């Protein structure tokens, strides 16, 4: 099955050639499953885990920045 669960937030980067084989999977979907996880592991060489903390880190950034205020920023 699929879990993973943070206590304190920390402020990581992740990596360039990491992230280009997540950000597109993203798009498919926010949360995928273990199969295109299997996928996406090779690129990112990270643990079901490790990925799905990222979604959970990501697809919760897209959906806050963007605020309705007037804030020109990094997205």
Do not use: C, H
């Not at 084989?21 to 798009?27: D, I, K, M, N």
């Amino acid at each position: 099955g699929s879990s993973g669960s943070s206590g304190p937030t920390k402020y990581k980067e992740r990596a360039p050639e990491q992230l280009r084989a997540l950000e597109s999977s993203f798009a498919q979907n926010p949360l995928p499953l273990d199969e295109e996880l299997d996928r996406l592991r090779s690129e990112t060489k990270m643990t079901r885990r490790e990925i799905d903390s990222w979604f959970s880190e990501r697809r919760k950034k897209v959906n806050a920045e963007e605020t309705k205020k007037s804030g020109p920023s990094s997205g």
